[PDB]
Amino acid sequence: ARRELKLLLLGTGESGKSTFIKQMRIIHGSGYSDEDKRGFTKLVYQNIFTAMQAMIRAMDTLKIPYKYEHNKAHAQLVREVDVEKVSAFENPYVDAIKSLWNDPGIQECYDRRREYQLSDSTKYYLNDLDRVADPSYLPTQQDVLRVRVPTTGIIEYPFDLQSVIFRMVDVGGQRSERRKWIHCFENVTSIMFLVALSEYDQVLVESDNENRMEESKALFRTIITYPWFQNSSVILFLNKKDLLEEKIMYSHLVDYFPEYDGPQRDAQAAREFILKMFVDLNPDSDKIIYSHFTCATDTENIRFVFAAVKDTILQLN
Amino acid sequence: QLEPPTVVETLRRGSKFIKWDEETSSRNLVTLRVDPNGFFLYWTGPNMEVDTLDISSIRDTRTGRYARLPKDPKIREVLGARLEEKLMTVVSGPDPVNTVFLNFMAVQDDTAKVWSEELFKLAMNILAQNASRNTFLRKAYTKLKLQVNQDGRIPVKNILKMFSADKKRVETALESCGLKFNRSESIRPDEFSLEIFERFLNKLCLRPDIDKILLEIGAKGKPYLTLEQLMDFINQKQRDPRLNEVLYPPLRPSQARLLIEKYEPNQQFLERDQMSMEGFSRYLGGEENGILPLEALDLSTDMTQPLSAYFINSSHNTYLTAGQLAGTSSVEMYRQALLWGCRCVELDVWKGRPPEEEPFITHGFTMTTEVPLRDVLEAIAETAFKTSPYPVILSFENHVDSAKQQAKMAEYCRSIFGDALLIEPLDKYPLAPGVPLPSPQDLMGRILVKNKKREMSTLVNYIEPVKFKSFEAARKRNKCFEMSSFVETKAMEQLTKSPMEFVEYNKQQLSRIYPKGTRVDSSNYMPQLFWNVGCQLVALNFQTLDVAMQLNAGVFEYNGRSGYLLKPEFMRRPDKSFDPFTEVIVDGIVANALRVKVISGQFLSDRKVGIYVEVDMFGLPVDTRRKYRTRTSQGNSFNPVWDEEPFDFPKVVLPTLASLRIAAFEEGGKFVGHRILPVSAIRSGYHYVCLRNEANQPLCLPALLIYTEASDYIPDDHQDYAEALINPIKHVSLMDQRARQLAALIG
Ligand SMILES: Nc1nc2c(ncn2[C@@H]2O[C@H](COP(=O)(O)OP(=O)(O)O)[C@@H](O)[C@H]2O)c(=O)[nH]1
Numbered sequence A: 001a002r003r004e005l006k007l008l009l010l011g012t013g014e015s016g017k018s019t020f021i022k023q024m025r026i027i028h029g030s031g032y033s034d035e036d037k038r039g040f041t042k043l044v045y046q047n048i049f050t051a052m053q054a055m056i057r058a059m060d061t062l063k064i065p066y067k068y069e070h071n072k073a074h075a076q077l078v079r080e081v082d083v084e085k086v087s088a089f090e091n092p093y094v095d096a097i098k099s100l101w102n103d104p105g106i107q108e109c110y111d112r113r114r115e116y117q118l119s120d121s122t123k124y125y126l127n128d129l130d131r132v133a134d135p136s137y138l139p140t141q142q143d144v145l146r147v148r149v150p151t152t153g154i155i156e157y158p159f160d161l162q163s164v165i166f167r168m169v170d171v172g173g174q175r176s177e178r179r180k181w182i183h184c185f186e187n188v189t190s191i192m193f194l195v196a197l198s199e200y201d202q203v204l205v206e207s208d209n210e211n212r213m214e215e216s217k218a219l220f221r222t223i224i225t226y227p228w229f230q231n232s233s234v235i236l237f238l239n240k241k242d243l244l245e246e247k248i249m250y251s252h253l254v255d256y257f258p259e260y261d262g263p264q265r266d267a268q269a270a271r272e273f274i275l276k277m278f279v280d281l282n283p284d285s286d287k288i289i290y291s292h293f294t295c296a297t298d299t300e301n302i303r304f305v306f307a308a309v310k311d312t313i314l315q316l317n
Numbered sequence B: 001q002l003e004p005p006t007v008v009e010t011l012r013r014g015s016k017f018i019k020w021d022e023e024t025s026s027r028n029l030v031t032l033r034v035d036p037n038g039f040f041l042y043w044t045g046p047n048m049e050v051d052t053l054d055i056s057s058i059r060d061t062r063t064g065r066y067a068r069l070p071k072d073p074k075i076r077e078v079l080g081a082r083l084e085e086k087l088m089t090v091v092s093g094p095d096p097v098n099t100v101f102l103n104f105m106a107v108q109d110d111t112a113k114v115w116s117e118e119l120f121k122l123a124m125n126i127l128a129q130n131a132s133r134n135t136f137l138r139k140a141y142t143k144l145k146l147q148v149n150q151d152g153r154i155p156v157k158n159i160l161k162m163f164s165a166d167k168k169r170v171e172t173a174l175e176s177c178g179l180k181f182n183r184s185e186s187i188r189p190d191e192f193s194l195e196i197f198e199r200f201l202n203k204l205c206l207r208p209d210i211d212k213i214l215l216e217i218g219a220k221g222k223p224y225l226t227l228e229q230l231m232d233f234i235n236q237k238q239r240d241p242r243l244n245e246v247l248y249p250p251l252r253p254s255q256a257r258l259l260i261e262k263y264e265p266n267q268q269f270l271e272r273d274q275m276s277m278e279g280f281s282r283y284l285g286g287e288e289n290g291i292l293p294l295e296a297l298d299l300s301t302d303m304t305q306p307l308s309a310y311f312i313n314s315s316h317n318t319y320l321t322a323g324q325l326a327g328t329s330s331v332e333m334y335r336q337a338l339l340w341g342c343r344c345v346e347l348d349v350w351k352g353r354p355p356e357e358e359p360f361i362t363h364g365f366t367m368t369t370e371v372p373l374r375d376v377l378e379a380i381a382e383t384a385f386k387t388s389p390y391p392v393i394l395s396f397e398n399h400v401d402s403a404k405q406q407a408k409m410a411e412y413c414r415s416i417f418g419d420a421l422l423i424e425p426l427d428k429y430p431l432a433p434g435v436p437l438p439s440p441q442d443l444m445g446r447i448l449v450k451n452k453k454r455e456m457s458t459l460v461n462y463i464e465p466v467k468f469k470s471f472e473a474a475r476k477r478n479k480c481f482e483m484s485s486f487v488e489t490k491a492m493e494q495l496t497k498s499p500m501e502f503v504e505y506n507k508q509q510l511s512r513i514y515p516k517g518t519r520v521d522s523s524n525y526m527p528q529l530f531w532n533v534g535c536q537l538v539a540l541n542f543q544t545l546d547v548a549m550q551l552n553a554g555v556f557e558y559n560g561r562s563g564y565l566l567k568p569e570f571m572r573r574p575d576k577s578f579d580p581f582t583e584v585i586v587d588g589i590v591a592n593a594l595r596v597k598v599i600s601g602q603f604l605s606d607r608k609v610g611i612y613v614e615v616d617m618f619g620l621p622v623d624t625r626r627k628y629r630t631r632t633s634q635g636n637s638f639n640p641v642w643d644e645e646p647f648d649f650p651k652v653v654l655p656t657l658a659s660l661r662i663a664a665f666e667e668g669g670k671f672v673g674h675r676i677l678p679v680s681a682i683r684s685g686y687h688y689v690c691l692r693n694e695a696n697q698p699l700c701l702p703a704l705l706i707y708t709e710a711s712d713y714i715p716d717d718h719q720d721y722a723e724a725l726i727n728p729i730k731h732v733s734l735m736d737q738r739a740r741q742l743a744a745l746i747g
């Protein structure tokens, strides 16, 4: 008598599913030895190179000059890198990226990251280059939590908690990827939808005109009304709340969702408006929904938030 | 990093070489050369006659000891440790059995080693064997310009010989380019331009099928295809719809330009960002527009999983050359097997004789020949890791019973193979229960012996035979190093009885399989049967290239011909488990659907005849269909265009296991060429499929145009739901319009 419950992680692109699966791996699963950490040192380097290439291209598109001219050269050096071929991280590329990150010109471009595509945790790495550039850098566990690796396929992870075994199914959150989702819609005990609170002022990678949060919203509203989940529980993680905390100061919610008329520059007011868009006034779903504000990079926040959700699920079984 | 094929200066500069013959005992001081592209080796010998060798036919290059010596005294005098250190030998042919040897003496010192080492590199190069359709046309061109008469010119009888599929229609093609069309004449390399070889091919072989594809894209104004039309075609038809837009992003506009700059005959379109029909026709046979990605052909499988998780390329009675009861036993096969990416070869060892005391390999005292062990062990030590740095499993069927001959056998192994021979277990992997079988990575360049254990038993460790009782008993003892060999019909009995117990066995232990004894002409069973249940060492007869063996060496090409393909996810995971006869799709396993419409073919035969094409699928029983066919075409083998309905493969259960087999056949049943495409990696869209011979070498001229649609499965009933997930914003917006309209009516 060892029960096995199947949990799906769903969500739009880059909402934080695979970041959650790592937290599950740290809390309950096997965790990261030094040999496991080392596996990502490559991936950290590739993220920095991908970051600055995408920022350089923006400088052209958005037509922003490089304050200092000697950084025009540096930009050319890096832009010609093949990022898939990155294994080490040495000069002149180190100082190239530093000298750039210091450039008042390209710092203007970072502030306008909203208009183009620049993955989150870009600033986490570039502010900490010297630690990463070092000739003996072992990645820290947060470095492994920040790392961005686009996910494709349908990867089932098992987890041995005391009472039960969870089989947590990770998936891709791009538009193409949802045509695969039907091949994990059997015997589902619960869904765990991830919405990225930061993406109210952002457009999708796969569609340039459409707003990420209109997608994440509509996707959730549709999916909970599907016949497969007629007897499945729906946990809604609103992730990336720390990013909101920073962004809501400058990017005003009223400008992208006109229904909002709570105060400006308020983190709390903004997040609780969103919550209502997802759950409230849905005629096709009258099941209860269990929300949760989260920060998948923040480990303590996840141990608390999930060691609750464990109960909520088992309790219904 | 997969480099493209690059000829070093020396090999175009040339080098002086003396061609010599074992049989008729001949000699010409010739200067060897390779063309810059690296298609052909060619030399000018018998009274100025240029003779060529197709490098894609080359099977091995040997120098020094391994370069065969001229055992005749008269030849040995004419030529002369130093003398053999400049001997070269080029082995080639269309399969392992029917090889051809060519010998050379380098006049200047140590250039033979430079030459041998570089011809091997060019021959094996993967980019070359999967070159673009357009490059394979440059091959045919480069042939004509090489093969010349004594006074340099290009004979016109060649140009008619090459495309001898409508000789009176060839005549008229040439005249229109301003070239010679009469059989008795020749053409100056001065004025046989590639530009002009291209224009010739256009007038000769007209493309109604491509005219179809342009208006079918959409261009009432037939002269021009604009930048976006191209980009939309490339993204919305040539792109594989099962791929992520972040990992494999779509073609940008600035990127789409570069393909116009690249493939353009007409500058009127180039300057104004358009494209001609012959620029579009150039793209279709282009380097970008291939059927498979290099990713697929590359060596980029995960090579750190345990040995029990990989399909291993395996030979049965390697020594045999055709028949099982009567015929040769060859040392040549052990090279031609291991050179072909095989990783398991069988050595049947029998006790020596009183006068001498050397063991010999042969077939169960029937009426076949013998060969000395000593040489076979050194044939294997030469070729073991010449085409793959991953381990070899020597399958000793030992019948030698004498501790004198048994100890030499263990000494021969330890001396010949040397440190490559895995003599004792590693640090990480002790021989105890619960320990997983070491990964291929962890055994790079090692010789694993498979013999019965309790001197030869000293060498045995991770591959040890045991008399199979049941899967229950094999799970009871639980040891990965123990493994079992199953005769065809014995493995077949397990398949219908306990196929699920089998996949579980193979998740930990190795299981070899070989053909039954009734197949005395060395006939091959279908290896997919046992691959389906995770069997690794599925052994086959390499002397026979029937539909089974054509498949084997076809699928094993992938992962850089290392001879190791990784079993699927669910056939490797212990926590997971499924049934190989599932007539319905599996949860956790994203199924696929497939469409295969055959459009046309180019330069398929050397004569007028009808042709037909077979499209078959090889995987799990339910995946497998193999009876689709075209109707034998009108009756001309230049540019036949089939007008047929797409062959449907709507429900592919496990798509990583499925392999498609496109194969062309002449009216009557003769083989033209085939190709093995893996269903998981194939692309969608209009694509050429450059054909191959039975031993999987690239035939140059013949090729097929086929339209593929490789999409994910959606049960018909659940289609509505699927489409709302892909684009929900449109789905919800539509419902909002309805609620919006009925707002006023309710109150
Ligand atoms: N600051 C912050 N970053 C996050 C949070 N959750 C995810 N990220 C980052 O955003 C990226 C998306 O993570 P991932 O799990 O791959 O999203 P998925 O594609 O939906 O699986 C990762 O690089 C994370 O570092 C969060 O709560 N706070």
Ligand SMILES: O=P(O)(O)O[C@@H]1[C@H](O)[C@H](O)[C@@H](OP(=O)(O)O)[C@H](OP(=O)(O)O)[C@H]1O
Binding pocket: B317, B364, B396, B397, B398, B465, B485, B514, B517
């Ligand atoms: O090669 P042939 O002529 O078909 O001979 C058989 C075949 O080689 C088997 O694989 C072999 O077992 P191993 O090769 O695994 O030793 C078996 O002998 P055995 O089962 O008595 O050893 C022979 O019956």
Ligand code: ALF
Binding pocket: A012, A013, A014, A015, A017, A018, A149, A150, A151, A152, A171, A172, A173, A174
């Ligand atoms: F949407 Al993902 F990795 F799950 F980019």
Ligand SMILES: [Ca+2]
Binding pocket: B317, B346, B347, B348, B397
């Ligand atoms: Ca045998």
Ligand SMILES: [Mg+2]
Binding pocket: A017, A018, A019, A149, A150, A151
């Ligand atoms: Mg992910």
